[PDB]
Amino acid sequence: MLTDPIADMLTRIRNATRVYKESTDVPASRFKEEILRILAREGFIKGYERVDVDGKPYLRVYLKYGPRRQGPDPRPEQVIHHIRRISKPGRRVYVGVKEIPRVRRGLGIAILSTSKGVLTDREARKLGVGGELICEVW
Amino acid sequence: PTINQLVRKGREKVRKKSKVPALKGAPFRRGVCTVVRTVTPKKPNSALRKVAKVRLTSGYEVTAYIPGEGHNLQEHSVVLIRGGRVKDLPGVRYHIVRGVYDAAGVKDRKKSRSKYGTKKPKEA
Amino acid sequence: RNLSALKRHRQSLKRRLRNKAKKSAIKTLSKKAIQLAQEGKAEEALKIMRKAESLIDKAAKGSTLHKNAAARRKSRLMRKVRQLLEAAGAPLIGGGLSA
Amino acid sequence: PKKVLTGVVVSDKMQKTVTVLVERQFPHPLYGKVIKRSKKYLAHDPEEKYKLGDVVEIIESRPISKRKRFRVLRLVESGRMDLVEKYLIRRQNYESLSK
Amino acid sequence: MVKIRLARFGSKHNPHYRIVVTDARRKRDGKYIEKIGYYDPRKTTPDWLKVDVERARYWLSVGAQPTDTARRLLRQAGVFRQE
Amino acid sequence: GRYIGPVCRLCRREGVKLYLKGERCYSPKCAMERRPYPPGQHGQKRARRPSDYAVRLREKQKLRRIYGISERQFRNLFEEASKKKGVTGSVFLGLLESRLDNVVYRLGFAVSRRQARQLVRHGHITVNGRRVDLPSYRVRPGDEIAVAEKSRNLELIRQNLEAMKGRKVGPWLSLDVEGMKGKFLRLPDREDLALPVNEQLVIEFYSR
RNA sequence: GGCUAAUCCCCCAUGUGGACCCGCCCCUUGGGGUGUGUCCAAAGGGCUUUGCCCGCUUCCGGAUGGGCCCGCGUCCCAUCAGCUAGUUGGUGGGGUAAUGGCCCACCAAGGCGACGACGGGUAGCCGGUCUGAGAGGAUGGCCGGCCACAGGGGCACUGAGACACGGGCCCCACUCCUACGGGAGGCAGCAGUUAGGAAUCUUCCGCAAUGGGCGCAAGCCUGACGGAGCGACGCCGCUUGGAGGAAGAAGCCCUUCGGGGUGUAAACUCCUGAACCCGGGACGAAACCCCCGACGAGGGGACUGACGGUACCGGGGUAAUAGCGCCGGCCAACUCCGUGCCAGCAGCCGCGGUAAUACGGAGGGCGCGAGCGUUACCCGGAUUCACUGGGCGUAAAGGGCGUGUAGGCGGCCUGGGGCGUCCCAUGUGAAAGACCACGGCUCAACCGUGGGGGAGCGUGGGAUACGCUCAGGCUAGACG
RNA sequence: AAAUUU
Ligand SMILES: [K+]
Ligand SMILES: [K+]
Ligand SMILES: [K+]
Ligand SMILES: [K+]
Ligand SMILES: [K+]
Ligand SMILES: [K+]
Ligand SMILES: [K+]
Ligand SMILES: [K+]
Ligand SMILES: [K+]
Ligand SMILES: [K+]
Ligand SMILES: [Mg+2]
Ligand SMILES: [Mg+2]
Ligand SMILES: [Mg+2]
Ligand SMILES: [Mg+2]
Ligand SMILES: [Mg+2]
Ligand SMILES: [Mg+2]
Ligand SMILES: [Mg+2]
Ligand SMILES: [Mg+2]
Ligand SMILES: [Mg+2]
Ligand SMILES: [Mg+2]
Ligand SMILES: [Mg+2]
Ligand SMILES: [Mg+2]
Ligand SMILES: [Mg+2]
Ligand SMILES: [Mg+2]
Ligand SMILES: [Mg+2]
Ligand SMILES: [Mg+2]
Ligand SMILES: [Mg+2]
Ligand SMILES: [Mg+2]
Ligand SMILES: [Mg+2]
Ligand SMILES: [Mg+2]
Ligand SMILES: [Mg+2]
Ligand SMILES: [Mg+2]
Ligand SMILES: [Mg+2]
Ligand SMILES: [Mg+2]
Ligand SMILES: [Mg+2]
Ligand SMILES: [Mg+2]
Ligand SMILES: [Mg+2]
Ligand SMILES: [Mg+2]
Ligand SMILES: [Mg+2]
Ligand SMILES: [Mg+2]
Ligand SMILES: [Mg+2]
Ligand SMILES: [Mg+2]
Ligand SMILES: [Mg+2]
Ligand SMILES: [Mg+2]
Ligand SMILES: [Mg+2]
Ligand SMILES: [Mg+2]
Ligand SMILES: [Mg+2]
Ligand SMILES: [Mg+2]
Ligand SMILES: [Mg+2]
Ligand SMILES: [Mg+2]
Ligand SMILES: [Mg+2]
Ligand SMILES: [Mg+2]
Ligand SMILES: [Mg+2]
Ligand SMILES: [Mg+2]
Ligand SMILES: [Mg+2]
Ligand SMILES: [Mg+2]
Ligand SMILES: [Mg+2]
Ligand SMILES: [Mg+2]
Ligand SMILES: [Mg+2]
Ligand SMILES: [Mg+2]
Ligand SMILES: [Mg+2]
Ligand SMILES: [Mg+2]
Ligand SMILES: [Mg+2]
Ligand SMILES: [Mg+2]
Ligand SMILES: [Mg+2]
Ligand SMILES: [Mg+2]
Ligand SMILES: [Mg+2]
Ligand SMILES: [Mg+2]
Ligand SMILES: [Mg+2]
Ligand SMILES: [Mg+2]
Ligand SMILES: [Mg+2]
Ligand SMILES: [Mg+2]
Ligand SMILES: [Mg+2]
Ligand SMILES: [Mg+2]
Ligand SMILES: [Mg+2]
Ligand SMILES: [Mg+2]
Ligand SMILES: [Mg+2]
Ligand SMILES: [Mg+2]
Ligand SMILES: [Mg+2]
Ligand SMILES: [Mg+2]
Ligand SMILES: [Mg+2]
Ligand SMILES: [Mg+2]
Ligand SMILES: [Mg+2]
Ligand SMILES: [Mg+2]
Ligand SMILES: [Mg+2]
Ligand SMILES: [Mg+2]
Ligand SMILES: [Mg+2]
Ligand SMILES: [Mg+2]
Ligand SMILES: [Mg+2]
Ligand SMILES: [Mg+2]
Ligand SMILES: [Mg+2]
Ligand SMILES: [Mg+2]
Ligand SMILES: [Mg+2]
Ligand SMILES: [Mg+2]
Ligand SMILES: [Mg+2]
Ligand SMILES: [Mg+2]
Ligand SMILES: [Mg+2]
Ligand SMILES: [Mg+2]
Ligand SMILES: [Mg+2]
Ligand SMILES: [Mg+2]
Ligand SMILES: [Mg+2]
Ligand SMILES: [Zn+2]
């Protein structure tokens, strides 16, 4: 089985974007869906949608890329340059509101799971609550 | 190692072995000479170095180097030793402090006097 | 060649003989009373327990048998006497023990 | 406020006494992992009311004896011998590593 | 008993006292119960003596005993003034 | 110690014309006008490409030897500035310019900074009325630096303030020549100073 | 052996009250109230003398100080894996101000341990300090808080309080007296001696200030303390001059023999005036006390300075200590001569065997400067024990393999709880230090005032995404 | 045989 479904989804997105795939299917779960909502809201993906594989429900994440570049290696710039899970099973990371990181001095995001839902770094700072530091994306 | 292993075993702090077993952590140690011999250096060099096996008040009896041009150190000479080794002399890890209790300062020394225990010369 | 605070020492000795005396009485009387409670003689037992309580409180007046340690001794004495008399009955003189 | 813990009765072999094992979770001071420690407390059961496996609350009390400084407040939930079995297995494993 | 006295806190030849409530048994520069004022004997600043009056009245009501110097400083600060 | 000794040898070694004697660094006798090469037997020889540490050390030594301040007080002032909020370099320059001896030099009371140091040390300078004999004294914005009334009859002060007629003073300073006094208006900006020193090189030198 | 006083001890009385047994009520562990019974108080002295002052006795409360108990945290070694007989618990006692197996009888067979018992080693702990970007590492000296100890060991007495540093008893070691029977002593109080050691001070001044003990007070005591002395041991401030002064003295060192360097450096010219010499000369010190008032509030008066004729102010006034390291690279600064794997240098790489910028000396230069170097030690660089922040095909490193215990970790959906997690309020976080601002010693070091902080823990309330738990459901994992 | 690879 999967020991960390959220990190598995993040790794699926990473490996899919690294080969410039169109979309990627992740085993569906409400937590993953609430995370993908933040992803699509911030613009790191074109969006997500529920689909069905042979018998089970999945989430198709439609990835996002930049324009094709010139010179050697015309592969476009990655929209998701870096996506890393932080609060892993076996070492869980909890942060207070004054302990929320500023990712890349504002250019990135940090997805938090707080008592008021799944938020971003600025969203949780504006709400004023902390929680489990799920991952960082920039 | 996994975080669980770090909680179980934990990192191991490294202790540094002292290069100068002049006990009590002293900067210097007083001793009395036993023999004042001449030892040949290792491969890259060749000379006649002046070494003395000093019996220390720390309970040790270790060989120590005699710097300077010339010295006056007999069998019963009482001298103070300090740290600092001589690389081209295996087994010698301590120096003699010239100018202390039996060891006159190097005579006719004018460039680096404080390091060899020679007082400032007289009138200009 | 020493200081005269040895006076204190002397005083302590006196006070020692003063305290050891009082306690030595109290304990003794206590035993006596308890014996008379074990053997059923109630009037005599209570008549002696009254004097034992009196000596306890009078020793509490000074530094010999001071604060509530004296109440501890009184409580244990009266409890033991009332318990031993209940093995026989008839609390005749009606002294320290309440009705 | 007097400290109140919650644990499992793992030893009723004493008279008027139980052994309440109490667990606690906390993040490691340096490695941040939520680690689980445990400690056994000798709790006072003056009526032999609680038996093995009972999950009970424990309250800080005036000392009853050496090593015995806690009373059993109330019964949280009745006997669940799974935790007692876990503790007994963890103890029995000690006989395998001697020499 | 508990006393109101002065504690020395300035440097050598530069004395600066804290008017302070503390047990008489503890040292004069030790852990005090409360700092109720400060006193500068050399009058270096325009404010060389300040005292919390209500706190001094409280500690006198509960039974603190000021030193003669402490009582003088408190009297100069109108702690005992009942006019 | 104040390094006391030859000065224009520093005019030579630093490669930039310094003004440590006051006059005679303006006259064709500074020995920098006629001997721009560094001192020593090997002064005229072809110099090798210096290391970065060489550049930073020489720049810091230039900035320090300009004011004649010992390494102890210099490092202390630098650390003090680095503790403060704001640009380390400009605050450091404002601190150095706030020294009483340097203020005396800037107000034209002395032709050189060392002459100003001797004037202060001998009690010929007053600050807000009170006599001060400390070159390391820090002048605050608003303080009136005056000449001692008992010293206003000396020949050197007469000469110096007789030459200051018509001369201008720094934008952060005012000068009353008749009363032989002046005021420290504000801390000088980096633009106000014409020092031939790169302060970032000194910051990087102490960054090591 | 004898005489005697008292705020010395005792008896009886008075019972505001309190103590105890028993009963009742409230409260909930021994908290509070009430009834009967019983038991328990006292000391006088001084006057400005029949009126106050210092006291005394019983009780309730405050305040301060402490005893005991509990959660959590506190080094290395698993080449220490089993430990425990008052051991674990009970009953009843003794003991203390008080719980307790603290101690003792009788009874039960328990208690602890890989979440590291037991054992060995090392070590007072902390506020802090050093370092570090931080996390962390190291450390616990000065000052402040708690602890323990007083030649080694043990014990009680007195007391509100001690198992009592300058109190007592005994054993041991040591020193001294000794009529040899027996006694005296205990600097890890101040200073000082000696020993050890690389190394750490005056057998000082003073009761003036602060604080402490006794006394109504006057006052007495105080090696606490306030000062001075010695030591560049540290930090900070300052001086050994300032300005003019040659296409450039001499000497010294190079040299293409033209010259170059030491260098405006010097001698000199003018000026200021460190040292010193005089005169004045402190703040720190106004209370206790006395007088008026009322021994209150308030007002007034008087005394008192170790430092010390010191600080500081005024006048006068002399150009008047510079040293230490380094110069091959790291690393800023180069030539000559001597030496010839010799003599030696060296933190690492390394240099010297004929022409050494590395040895030694000279000239010159660089770096600091009343200091400069060396050694020792700590942190740093060191991401080189890697939480932040590392690795294991061939560089040190995957166990020879499996089964599997504890442990660690846990697919999807709904609900309850709110342990982890998060939030708000509140308490705590002593002072000093650290940070910021202003201010006092001419600045600074130093110091004062004010401000700001802050992890952690307690309490009350709230949130439920995730981790947890309980209950139910699903089939993608697993098994059949 | 040792040191130096120029
Ligand atoms: K066993
Ligand atoms: K009654
Ligand atoms: K109390
Ligand atoms: K004592
Ligand atoms: K003069
Ligand atoms: K009065
Ligand atoms: K003068
Ligand atoms: K030779
Ligand atoms: K040389
Ligand atoms: K951390
Ligand atoms: Mg927290
Ligand atoms: Mg920032
Ligand atoms: Mg903005
Ligand atoms: Mg000899
Ligand atoms: Mg006496
Ligand atoms: Mg007496
Ligand atoms: Mg008898
Ligand atoms: Mg007693
Ligand atoms: Mg539990
Ligand atoms: Mg039982
Ligand atoms: Mg019991
Ligand atoms: Mg105390
Ligand atoms: Mg005032
Ligand atoms: Mg009043
Ligand atoms: Mg700055
Ligand atoms: Mg800064
Ligand atoms: Mg007689
Ligand atoms: Mg007679
Ligand atoms: Mg009496
Ligand atoms: Mg009554
Ligand atoms: Mg009576
Ligand atoms: Mg009487
Ligand atoms: Mg009368
Ligand atoms: Mg009296
Ligand atoms: Mg308490
Ligand atoms: Mg025991
Ligand atoms: Mg018992
Ligand atoms: Mg007692
Ligand atoms: Mg045990
Ligand atoms: Mg445990
Ligand atoms: Mg120890
Ligand atoms: Mg820092
Ligand atoms: Mg710091
Ligand atoms: Mg730190
Ligand atoms: Mg420590
Ligand atoms: Mg200490
Ligand atoms: Mg201390
Ligand atoms: Mg001793
Ligand atoms: Mg002893
Ligand atoms: Mg003894
Ligand atoms: Mg007493
Ligand atoms: Mg003791
Ligand atoms: Mg004793
Ligand atoms: Mg003594
Ligand atoms: Mg004796
Ligand atoms: Mg000696
Ligand atoms: Mg001393
Ligand atoms: Mg004296
Ligand atoms: Mg005094
Ligand atoms: Mg006094
Ligand atoms: Mg002192
Ligand atoms: Mg200095
Ligand atoms: Mg000159
Ligand atoms: Mg003159
Ligand atoms: Mg005065
Ligand atoms: Mg009167
Ligand atoms: Mg008055
Ligand atoms: Mg007096
Ligand atoms: Mg005097
Ligand atoms: Mg003068
Ligand atoms: Mg170089
Ligand atoms: Mg050398
Ligand atoms: Mg070294
Ligand atoms: Mg030759
Ligand atoms: Mg040569
Ligand atoms: Mg050379
Ligand atoms: Mg030289
Ligand atoms: Mg040094
Ligand atoms: Mg190191
Ligand atoms: Mg590290
Ligand atoms: Mg680092
Ligand atoms: Mg290492
Ligand atoms: Mg790691
Ligand atoms: Mg590695
Ligand atoms: Mg290998
Ligand atoms: Mg293998
Ligand atoms: Mg398990
Ligand atoms: Mg398992
Ligand atoms: Mg789950
Ligand atoms: Mg689980
Ligand atoms: Mg739920
Ligand atoms: Mg909660
Ligand atoms: Mg603080
Ligand atoms: Mg402060
Ligand atoms: Mg100031
Ligand atoms: Mg706060
Ligand atoms: Mg809460
Ligand atoms: Mg809810
Ligand atoms: Mg289920
Ligand atoms: Mg199948
Ligand atoms: Mg060779
Ligand atoms: Zn010049």
Write the DSSP assignment of F76-135 as a string of letters.
Answer: HHHHHHHHSSS-HHHHHHHHHHTBHHHHHHHTTSSSSHHHHHHHHHTT-EEETTEE---T
Q: How far apart are CA B35 and CA B58, in angstroms?
A: 18
- A23-27 and A57-63 beta bridge pairing: antiparallel
Beta-bridge partners for A48: A61
Q: How far apart are CA F18 and CA F37, in angstroms?
A: 14
Any idea what DSSP says for residue A52? E
Q: Give, in order, the Cα–Cα distances in Å from C66 to each of A10, A119, C10, F183.
A: 78, 70, 22, 80
Q: Where are the domains of chain A?
A: 3-80, 81-138
Q: How far apart are CA D48 and CA D75, in angstroms?
A: 13
Protein-proximal nucleotides of chain G (any atom < 7 Å from a CB): 9-12, 18-22, 29, 35-42, 58, 62-65, 68-73, 76-77, 81-82, 88-91, 93-102, 108-115, 135-138, 143-146, 157-161, 164, 166-168, 185-186, 196-199, 209-213, 224-228, 236-248, 253-254, 260-265, 270-274, 283-288, 296-298, 313-315, 319, 322-327, 330-335, 341-353, 360-370, 372-379, 385-387, 390-392, 405-414, 419-424, 430, 432, 435-437, 439-444, 446-450, 458-459, 462-467, 475-477
- Please give the distance of CA F125 from its chain centroid, rounded to a whole number: 17
Is-contact F159 F118, C-beta < 8 A? no
Residue C68 φ/ψ, nearest 5 degrees:
-40, 0
Nearest to residue D9, comparing CAs of D60, D43, D59, D32? D43
Alpha helices in chain D (DSSP H): 81-92
Q: How far apart are CA B25 and CA A134, in angstroms?
A: 51
* Residue C14, C-beta contacts closer than 8 angstroms, at least 6 positions apart: none
Residue E10 φ/ψ, nearest 5 degrees:
-75, 180
* Cβ-based burial of A50 (10 A; exposed 0-12, middle 13-18, buried ≥19): exposed
* Residue E42, C-beta contacts closer than 8 angstroms, at least 6 positions apart: E14, E15, E48
Nearest to residue F121, comparing CAs of F101, F106, F102? F101
Nearest to residue B102, comparing CAs of B119, B79, B82, B76? B79
How is residue C36 written in tokens? Answer: 């008379």
Q: Where are the domains of chain D?
A: 1-99
Could you give the count of Cα atoms lying within 13 Å of F88 in the half-sphere of its Cβ?
17
Beta-bridge partners for B31: B56, B79
- To which residue do tokens 């600043």 refer? E45
Residue E37 φ/ψ, nearest 5 degrees:
180, -175
Which amino acid is it at F10?
A: L
Ligand lying closest to the C-alpha of residue D77: 19
- F67 plus F106 within the same structural domain: no
Range of the domain at E82: 1-83
How is residue E25 written in tokens? Answer: 């048994």
CB atoms within 10 A of CB A88: 15
Q: How far apart are CA E16 and CA E9, in angstroms?
A: 5
Q: Give, in order, the Cα–Cα distances in Å from A73 to each of A21, A23, A132.
A: 17, 22, 39
Q: How far apart are CA A109 and CA D65, in angstroms?
A: 58
- E2-8 and E65-66 beta bridge pairing: parallel
Residue F160 φ/ψ, nearest 5 degrees:
-65, -45
Q: How far apart are CA C52 and CA C25, in angstroms?
A: 9
Radius of gyration of chain F (CA): 18
The nucleotide lying nearest B44 (C-alpha to C1') is: H3
Q: How far apart are CA F20 and CA F112, in angstroms?
A: 6
Q: How far apart are the first and last CA of chain E?
A: 30
Q: How far apart are CA A138 and CA A68, in angstroms?
A: 20
- Helix (H) or strand (E) holding C36, with range, is helix C6-38
Crossing angle for the helix pair A30-42 and A5-18, nearest 10 degrees?
Answer: 40
- A131-137 and B49-56 beta bridge pairing: unpaired
Q: Where are the beta strands (DSSP E) in chain E?
A: 2-8, 17-23, 34-39, 49-51, 65-66
Q: How far apart are CA A135 and CA A119, in angstroms?
A: 11
Is-contact C82 C95, C-beta < 8 A? no
Is the CATH number 2.40.50.140 carried by domain B1-124? yes
- Helix (H) or strand (E) holding A33, with range, is helix A30-42
* Residue F8, C-beta contacts closer than 8 angstroms, at least 6 positions apart: F18, F20, F21, F25, F30, F31, F32
- To which residue do tokens 């270096």 refer? E44
- B49-56 and B28-39 beta bridge pairing: antiparallel
* Cβ-based burial of A137 (10 A; exposed 0-12, middle 13-18, buried ≥19): buried
How is residue C75 written in tokens? Answer: 């409580």
Q: Give, in order, the Cα–Cα distances in Å from D93 to each of B5, D10, D12, D86, F120.
A: 21, 17, 21, 11, 85
Mind giving me the DSSP string for A81-136? Answer: --EEE-SBTTB--EE-GGG---GGGGTSEEEEEETTEEE-HHHHHHHT--EEEEEE
Any idea what DSSP says for residue C8? H
Planar angle of CA A71, A76, A77, nearest 5 degrees: 110
Q: How far apart are CA C4 and CA A86, in angstroms?
A: 78
CATH topology of domain A81-138: Dna Ligase; domain 1 (3.30.1490)
How is residue A101 written in tokens? Answer: 């990181």
- F171 plus F207 within the same structural domain: no
Number of residues written out for chain A: 138
Residues 80-99 of A with CB under 8 A from D: 90-94
CB atoms within 10 A of CB F161: 18
Nearest to residue C83, comparing CAs of C34, C47, C11? C34
CB atoms within 10 A of CB D71: 17
* Residue E6, C-beta contacts closer than 8 angstroms, at least 6 positions apart: E17, E18, E19, E20, E28, E39, E67, E69, E70, E73
Which amino acid is it at A10?
A: L
Beta-bridge partners for D6: D57
Is-contact B94 B85, C-beta < 8 A? yes
Q: How far apart are the first and last CA of chain B?
A: 70
CA of C16 to C1' of G212 (A): 31
Considering its fold, how many domains does chain F have in total?
Answer: 2
Q: How far apart are CA A103 and CA F185, in angstroms?
A: 45
CA of E2 to C1' of G148 (A): 27
- F145 plus F199 within the same structural domain: no
Which amino acid is it at D59?
A: I
Q: How far apart are CA C36 and CA C85, in angstroms?
A: 9
Q: How far apart are the first and last CA of chain C?
A: 65
Q: How far apart are CA D52 and CA D18, in angstroms?
A: 9
Q: What sign does the dihedral D7-D11-D14-D19 (CA atoms) show?
A: negative
Q: How far apart are CA F35 and CA A61, in angstroms?
A: 76
Planar angle of CA F39, F44, F47, nearest 5 degrees: 95
* Residue C53, C-beta contacts closer than 8 angstroms, at least 6 positions apart: C74, C77, C78, C96
Q: How far apart are CA C19 and CA B60, in angstroms?
A: 64
Q: How far apart are CA D31 and CA A44, in angstroms?
A: 32
Q: In angstroms, what is the span from residue D1 Cα to ligand 92's centroid?
A: 18
Q: How far apart are CA E64 and CA E23, in angstroms?
A: 9
Q: Give, in order, the Cα–Cα distances in Å from E63 to each of A91, E26, E58.
A: 58, 17, 9
- Cβ distance of B3 and D31 shorter than 8 Å: yes
How is residue E2 written in tokens? Answer: 């508990």
Considering its fold, how many domains does chain E have in total?
Answer: 1
Is-contact A40 A20, C-beta < 8 A? no
- To which residue do tokens 């039996």 refer? B102
User: What does the longest C-alpha to C-alpha distance in chain E come to?
Assistant: 40
Is-contact F147 F125, C-beta < 8 A? yes
Alpha helices in chain F (DSSP H): 8-13, 52-67, 71-83, 88-97, 100-106, 113-121, 155-163, 199-207
Residue B101 φ/ψ, nearest 5 degrees:
75, -25
- Please give the distance of CA C67 from its chain centroid, rounded to a whole number: 14
Q: How far apart are CA F207 and CA F203, in angstroms?
A: 6
Range of the domain at F64: 1-96+194-208
Q: Where are the domains of chain C?
A: 1-99
Q: Where are the domains of chain B?
A: 1-124
Kindly report the CATH number that applies to the domain delimited by C1-99. Answer: 1.20.58.110
